[PDB]
Amino acid sequence: SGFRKMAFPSGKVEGCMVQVTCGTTTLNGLWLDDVVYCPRHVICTSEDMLNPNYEDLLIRKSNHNFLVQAGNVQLRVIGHSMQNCVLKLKVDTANPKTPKYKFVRIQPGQTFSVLACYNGSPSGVYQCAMRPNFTIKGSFLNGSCGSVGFNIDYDCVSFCYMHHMELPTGVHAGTDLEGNFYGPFVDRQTAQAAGTDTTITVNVLAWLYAAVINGDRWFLNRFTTTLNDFNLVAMKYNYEPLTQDHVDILGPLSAQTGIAVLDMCASLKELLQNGMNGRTILGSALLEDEFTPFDVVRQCSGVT
Amino acid sequence: SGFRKMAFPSGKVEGCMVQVTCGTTTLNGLWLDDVVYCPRHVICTSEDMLNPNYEDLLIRKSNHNFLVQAGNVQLRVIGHSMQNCVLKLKVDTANPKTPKYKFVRIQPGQTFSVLACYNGSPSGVYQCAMRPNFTIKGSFLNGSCGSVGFNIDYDCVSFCYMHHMELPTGVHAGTDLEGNFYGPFVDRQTAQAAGTDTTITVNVLAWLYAAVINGDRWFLNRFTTTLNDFNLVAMKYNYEPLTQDHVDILGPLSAQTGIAVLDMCASLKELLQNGMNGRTILGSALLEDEFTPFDVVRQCSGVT
């Protein structure tokens, strides 16, 4: 029992983190097989970052300008290419600690663990969600760029995020491991405003199931609702519209708890309309939206 | 910027987790050098757990009854002893992945990461605090016993917790790595009620500093208070008394922010007296007490 914001074990990713230095800029790289992945803004001066021409900046760079250090051992760079907003540094040594892995581009609402790193060294691990506005609400200081977001399926690390940007509002933007930004963000120091940070409704419902499973039940009510009725309330409260897909995804939690998804929606509806009245749900005074239905099943069943 | 509930990277502890089976009971062990540490209730039937005589139960056990598996490789047990509420299983092989480590008994209010494991396999990592009532609010299912709590200082893992018990109220009790329980808890299935779960006042203040540092300032007020005045309010709200020790510990955060500790106390006093009025602080609608001043400095400065 008990329910916690839980990150994947980070060991498999710890073994992949290196330091990339180009000129005076040091940040983190991901070493998988004989390639090191890093943010392309490693080639910029902070002067460059106002309106950088990456192709033009990269022409001035050779393999030997990219200083790649794995622990206190230097890797030999034997090639470099830009793919979207990442650099791929070909090194002469396959990472011996390379786990089974995939690159996946996640959808908004999907959760992942971040291994925050500085100078290729892990400092900590936390669980995030890709927000509906394609930001993440991270914890990233200068030198944390190249830190990666990931999921683990048993032995396979799915890398879904690399850290590039802090927006002027202190929220975070970055890329998949093909170096395409989530959302409309660019690796440029410019006016970049996030859209509406809406609540991930399906994640909130999953987390209400997790609460019932773990004994927190005070918010279960006598009511039900319809998808259309619920969605009217969700719109009003800047919650994502709930789809039949979401309902389907919540099926197993429905089945385990014997609470119909639409009943749980009516519980969520009353919470939105009436607030918590100073009560808490799983030690939170607001509606948590960074657990997926999959996250709830995993934690509540003890999958390794 | 941004501030997250952050666990230590778990890799160094991942490398220490094994499966211990005695009779029909499987749980987790910690393999450091040529010793495997596990909860002594591994020798119990759940029938035993009502009033177990561990010395008497252990007499019936031989080295070869303790089945220790590290990945899919069996370790040879060449000795066993009970130290308080843990078993030390001497194996014929030193754990090659043994990190630099210490056993430390932590104080209430101190924070640590848990690597939740099942069958010697890591499932996830989260950050806890040792509550003032010597419980932790964990996420532990059956098979999670032997999961460990730890801190890391650069290269040194300080193990502070091993998981043993869920109390009837779904909070968690366990031992240091010398197998002494935190609080008055016993490895027995009996009436065991937690005391008052008070709020860790110094941790809340640290977290208010973390908020100011990260731009959340709406709760800074025009007031100050005294330790004695503040402590009157803390008593009323089941907050731990604030000592000059706590004030001293908050000094660096005081210095960085230019907000006197006693001013921040008066801010906390108004929050206790007036509530958040539907506002949030670092994405929380209650006063977070599971960041230490040390945790705030570490995260806010990017220590690895």
Ligand SMILES: *CC(=O)N1CCN(S(=O)(=O)c2ccc(C)cc2C)CC1
């Ligand atoms: C994204 C990231 O973590 N970066 C990019 C900025 N550089 S830097 O070297 O230009 C730099 C900028 C500002 C400060 C205070 C310090 C540094 C090192 C670091 C990596």
Ligand SMILES: *CC(=O)N1CCN(S(=O)(=O)c2ccc(C)cc2C)CC1
């Ligand atoms: C503390 C812990 O995680 N334990 C102790 C209980 N045992 S068990 O094998 O007795 C057991 C009890 C109940 C269930 C549903 C399942 C098991 C395996 C597991 C380890």
